[PDB]
Subunit: 220 residues, 4 copies
Amino acid sequence: MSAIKPDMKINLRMEGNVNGHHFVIDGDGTGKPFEGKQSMDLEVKEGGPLPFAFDILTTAFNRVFAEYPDHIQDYFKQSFPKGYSWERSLTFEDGGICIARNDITMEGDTFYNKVRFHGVNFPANGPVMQKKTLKWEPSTEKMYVRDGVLTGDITMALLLEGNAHYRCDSRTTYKAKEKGVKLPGYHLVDHCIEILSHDKDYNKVKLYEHAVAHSGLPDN
Amino acid sequence: SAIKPDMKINLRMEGNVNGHHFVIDGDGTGKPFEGKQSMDLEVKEGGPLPFAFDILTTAFNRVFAEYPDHIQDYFKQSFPKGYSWERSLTFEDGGICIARNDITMEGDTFYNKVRFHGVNFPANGPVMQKKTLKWEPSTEKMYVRDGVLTGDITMALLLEGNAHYRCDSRTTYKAKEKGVKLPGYHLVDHCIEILSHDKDYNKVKLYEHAVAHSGLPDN
Amino acid sequence: HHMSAIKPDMKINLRMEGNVNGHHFVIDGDGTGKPFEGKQSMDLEVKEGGPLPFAFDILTTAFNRVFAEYPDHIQDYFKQSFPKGYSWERSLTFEDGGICIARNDITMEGDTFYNKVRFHGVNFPANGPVMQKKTLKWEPSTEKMYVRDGVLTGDITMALLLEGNAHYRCDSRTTYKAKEKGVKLPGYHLVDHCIEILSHDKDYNKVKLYEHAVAHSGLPDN
Amino acid sequence: MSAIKPDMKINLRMEGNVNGHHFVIDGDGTGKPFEGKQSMDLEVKEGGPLPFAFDILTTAFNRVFAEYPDHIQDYFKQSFPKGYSWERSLTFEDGGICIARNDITMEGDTFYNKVRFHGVNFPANGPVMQKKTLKWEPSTEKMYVRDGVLTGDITMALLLEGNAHYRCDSRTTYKAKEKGVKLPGYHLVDHCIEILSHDKDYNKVKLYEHAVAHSGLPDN
Ligand SMILES: O=S([O-])[O-]
């Protein structure tokens, strides 16, 4: 009833502004929604080289690519073909704050992603502006309903040079476009996002993501 | 030098709160040295706004604050070239807004390019339900962090029914010209009010009064 | 690096003294567990301050990461911290302003872990779910373990299930410190947790608690 | 007739534990409730010399001593002779968290303060454990009612050696012991606290505080 196919293309356009620097990044990728895997090639079309760590944008670069077991309601796959949208806040431990949105629509075998990303108050000597990030660590999103809306909260951490970490708290709210899509119960979503390759200045990046929903111990 | 006793304000805000895009124009006047400014606002697009207009109002210029002679006035020292600010508002129910302003001057007019984005406001909360009455008067705590003037504020919106809605504000302020000397720690008292509005806030008259001081016992 | 003297089956002796919103209480615990299976359980008895005027659940995460199953590719700080032991301190920040801090000093004698627990909580609203006892249980969660300023630290996004099927969020931060020199710090990893009140009397003066915890490295290898 | 006299004495005993270090501090002071001023001599009875910055304890060492104007209800002066108590959390930007409680009663011309202070999760290399604090900057408490209880929130900042600042957010709830003390409307309370003198290791400290409530601008 979704018309979500086992192999899907992804078409993404993101425009943003972090600390006054405007950028536009295009993505073209492919994914396996039922396998919870996606990858994409990204190109900074405007505003490169980015004066800040590319990693902070990468979670903005679609929970339709999360493997859901049968015992958990899969709000995202049930949201199609009309699609859904999300809004997120990323609160970093040094006061940097970003918000992002994405409206996901599907035409055929392609998801289209309209992504906006704005960040403010990153310290000049912090690891984001000084590009000291190495990767996001694997994380687990906590998904619950609040005020009739599916919401995901995650304790996230960017690995830095020296193997220090930089903490970020994210909150995302997810909203099906079509009315009456059934909200899931509380669950967890394991995430692992990775930049597989990049040019020296991150004007081109290959990004990979793997996400699996589960109900926690003892069952997972 | 740059800043005259009476001064005009031209503002354009583009925003998106909870996915609703809007554009608001502002034409105003103030007295920088008395720390008072007033502005007429017209929602040019996205009207009527589906959310509390009050959340936008602190984004609608610290050059309009009365600084006393004993405290360095970074804002007036930033002109003619001007300065910019970036702000996050973290509301107690998870709603978060970020805003930027780039302020420039030509002649007797300040030009404000304002952007405002808000996400994650709950549908039955006072913001989406428009249950706000006003920002309470507040005090900004101004300090330097990582070489940047920063202002933090414990803010509270009065709601219908006499409850309050808490927000924490952090603003960073940056002069465009290199070498503007940063102030030491100080406070800025703020009072913002909507003086009038039409029923759906497509037109609003806004007024703000701000005074910088060094706290007790000398304030 | 050395023999821990941690046996596959251990006893637990716990004494907690605390104050939440001005109400003092003392709670004693006797339990047993399997450190290598990451499972433990204990019978708790409120020794005074009973019956508690707040939700018992907020105390439960304070009632030992030595009971967590670690795979051998993740360094297990807690088991190596024995025989001498370790201590932790923790803050719980609840979404409505309630804030708790808690400390445990853990030692081992023979086949028994001894836990000296303190718990202090302030600013919970009178009509909030903690003070009105509207909580059902903690949801399963995942702690993110990492080294922060040279100290092993775990941060958790937690949520209490309430009556009416709402959730009440809490953020926890715990610092863990071995008592002896030479304990190797682990790299970033995750710890799945699930805690549950198995049974209780009407006023929670008596409670049976169980916990299961498993360490892992996240996707793709978990 | 009034329980609040123009010249009052203060008797205080604090017991605390910060980062596992236990301590007991006794305080003997005087103040002028109507002028919003008080001072106290403190002596560390147990656990001295303290291994952390004494300044973090100082706001725990009574809003009875705040000058309130006629047009703002003075909850604190109206709470006596029976008294009131407060509970507070101090959330420092580097993860240190302190909670404190004070139960204040009165006998004759003396206030009795039973204070408890606990802190956890201060980093070894941070300004509290390294004793790099110089003072609390002057601040303004925002006072409002929430769920029937008078609550005060403050954006606070410790000046550090080197002219940096260390941020702390505090929230305090205040509750009269008598039923029927009328809650105030929203208002502000300016505070300044200062250590007037101390011995090298802070085993003896003289502390002073001045507080004035007001309605904000325009008025004052
Ligand atoms: O993991 S549960 O069964 O406590």
